[PDB]
Design a protein around this ligand. Structure first.
Ligand SMILES: *[C@@H]1O[C@H](CO)[C@@H](O[C@@H]2O[C@H](CO)[C@@H](O[C@@H]3O[C@H](CO[C@H]4O[C@H](CO)[C@@H](O)[C@H](O)[C@@H]4O)[C@@H](O)[C@H](O[C@H]4O[C@H](CO)[C@@H](O)[C@H](O)[C@@H]4O[C@H]4O[C@H](CO)[C@@H](O)[C@H](O)[C@@H]4O)[C@@H]3O)[C@H](O)[C@H]2NC(C)=O)[C@H](O)[C@H]1NC(C)=O
Ligand SMILES: *[C@@H]1O[C@H](CO)[C@@H](O[C@@H]2O[C@H](CO)[C@@H](O[C@@H]3O[C@H](CO)[C@@H](O)[C@H](O)[C@@H]3O)[C@H](O)[C@H]2NC(C)=O)[C@H](O)[C@H]1NC(C)=O
Ligand SMILES: *[C@@H]1O[C@H](CO)[C@@H](O[C@@H]2O[C@H](CO)[C@@H](O)[C@H](O)[C@H]2NC(C)=O)[C@H](O)[C@H]1NC(C)=O
Ligand SMILES: *[C@@H]1O[C@H](CO)[C@@H](O)[C@H](O)[C@H]1NC(C)=O
Ligand SMILES: *[C@@H]1O[C@H](CO)[C@@H](O)[C@H](O)[C@H]1NC(C)=O
Ligand SMILES: *[C@@H]1O[C@H](CO)[C@@H](O)[C@H](O)[C@H]1NC(C)=O
Ligand SMILES: *[C@@H]1O[C@H](CO)[C@@H](O)[C@H](O)[C@H]1NC(C)=O
Lengths: 48, 104, 48, 128
């Protein structure tokens, strides 16, 4: 039995920290892909 | 929704008022009480939750596709029309029983 | 073969339909007997 | 929170009835549903329709829907029910009411519960 309400498992990540981390990653990608190249992140598509 | 047109109980005795319908598989029964000439109030809502201000006599069950409001040792102050209120399966928020006339 | 229904038929959170209440016969310590077991399973582990 | 209602009272057949619900101690823009319910003396509490307080989405009673309009004014925290082609069947007490949402878990995951009619107004009696 569930001893109370059924709740979904989840994870929390601070938005500001992720935004700064991702920006740093983008700068390092630009060093290989170009200073004027657009870097876009997207969710995984196919697979299980 | 269909519900018992009336129920007659002696003063001080427990009653059980039961409603039935098809939408109750996915929605909770919300029991309301309206004394004639008075503004109706919410008695039981959701997963057998009791709003503040309602005596502990009022409780219930949503088993199957029915709902039951039980009033332990019904008092003279509880003489009112009772209604089993729930939402329709299409998402429309109206599905409402005819009402049970409770006489104590 | 499992016979299952929804654990919380009246739930509107993202957990609606995620936990199923399944019944099965299993086995017992003796080879002559069977029992009836009810347990909850996650949707992702059970195939219709 | 308190709810109050007012309107024309007696109207003639085929006239349009307009009822207004006002609030005390609340803000309609909250994530709550506001509704209108009709109760003639010989019947129970038959819902008229509703409007979402925060979004303006509405639902109506299918047997009534084509002749009923429900709207809200964010300014002045008010609601109104406009009923066209009023007939003898509408000689009933009209009520405004609000629903509420309780929270037990994470709001963005839908871990909420409905409490459909928490506060009722006193209503108004209209005639035709
Ligand atoms: C990731 O980040 C998210 C936020 O982005 C965070 O979600 C938050 O989770 C907490 C739970 O951990 C949620 O807290 C609930 O909030 C509601 C609503 O709060 C209002 O009311 C309280 C009243 O005290 C005010 O203080 C508050 O300011 C608001 O006005 C509460 O109702 C919840 O309380 C119920 O559950 C508690 C469990 O401890 C009970 O102790 C409490 O009494 C309440 O009980 C319920 O059950 C009772 C059964 O008898 C019933 O009688 C009660 O009436 C009631 O139904 C709880 O405090 C918070 O809202 C979430 N925030 C959002 C935005 O969703 C995640 O937790 C976080 N995760 C991680 C891993 O970091
Ligand atoms: C809003 O929609 C509801 C349907 O969900 C309408 O309710 C229906 O109204 C009619 C008119 O009175 C009811 O018929 C009557 O029922 C009583 C039952 O005691 C009977 O004695 C009468 O002779 C007549 O048959 C009908 O039962 C009722 N259905 C319900 C409540 O499910 C309601 O009228 C609509 N509102 C408007 C303003 O049209
Ligand atoms: C899974 O569903 C069964 C019923 O289909 C639950 O067993 C019932 O539990 C109630 C109490 O809530 C008893 O009154 C019934 O007699 C039980 N029925 C049987 C056949 O035993 C079972 O508890 C559910 N599983 C969980 C984890 O709650
Ligand atoms: C995780 O929990 C810690 C406390 O143990 C808190 O200080 C930290 O901010 C939390 N992180 C997030 C992303 O919520
Ligand atoms: C943070 O998020 C905003 C979202 O508009 C984005 O424009 C910005 O580049 C991100 N990074 C920083 C460092 O602000
Ligand atoms: C990108 O900018 C850096 C300066 O931060 C410069 O050294 C580098 O040569 C530039 N690359 C291109 C391809 O323009
Ligand atoms: C368990 O076995 C019995 C036969 O002894 C059968 O009737 C019953 O349906 C079985 N239970 C399930 C969940 O299949």
């Amino acid at each position: 039995d569930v001893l109370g309400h059924v709740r979904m498992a989840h994870c929390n990540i601070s938005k500001a920290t992720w935004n700064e981390t991702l920006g740093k990653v983008v700068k390092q990608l630009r060093k290989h892909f170009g200073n004027n190249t657009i870097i876009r992140f997207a969710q995984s598509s196919g697979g299980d | 929704l269909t519900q018992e047109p009336a129920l007659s109980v002696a003063l001080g005795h427990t009653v059980s008022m039961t409603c039935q319908g098809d939408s109750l598989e996915t929605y909770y029964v919300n029991w309301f009480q309206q004394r004639p000439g008075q503004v109706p109030v919410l008695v039981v809502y959701g997963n057998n939750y009791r709003p503040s201000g309602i005596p502990e006599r009022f409780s219930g069950s949503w088993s199957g596709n029915t709902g039951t409001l039980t009033i332990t040792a019904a008092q003279v102050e509880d003489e009112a029309d009772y209604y089993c209120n729930s939402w329709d399966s299409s998402g429309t928020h109206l599905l409402f029983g005819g009402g049970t006339r409770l006489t104590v | 073969t499992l016979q299952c229904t929804n654990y919380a038929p009246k739930l509107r959170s993202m957990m609606r339909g995620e936990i199923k209440n399944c019944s099965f016969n299993m086995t017992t310590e003796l080879r002559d007997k069977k029992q009836k077991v009810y347990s909850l399973f996650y949707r992702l582990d059970v195939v219709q | 929170v308190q709810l109050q209602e007012s309107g024309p009272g007696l109207v003639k057949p085929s006239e349009t009835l307009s009822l207004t619900c006002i609030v005390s101690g609340d803000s309609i823009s909250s994530s709550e549903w506001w509704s209108w319910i009709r109760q003639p003396p010989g019947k129970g509490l038959e819902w008229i329709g509703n409007i979402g307080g925060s979004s303006g989405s509405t639902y109506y009673n299918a047997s009534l829907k084509s002749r009923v309009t429900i709207s809200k004014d964010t300014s002045k925290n008010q609601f109104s029910l406009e009923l066209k082609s009023v007939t003898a069947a509408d000689t009933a007490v009209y009520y405004c009411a609000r629903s509420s949402i309780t929270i037990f878990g994470v709001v963005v995951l839908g871990e909420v519960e409905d409490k459909p009619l928490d506060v009722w107004g006193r209503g108004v009696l209209v005639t035709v």
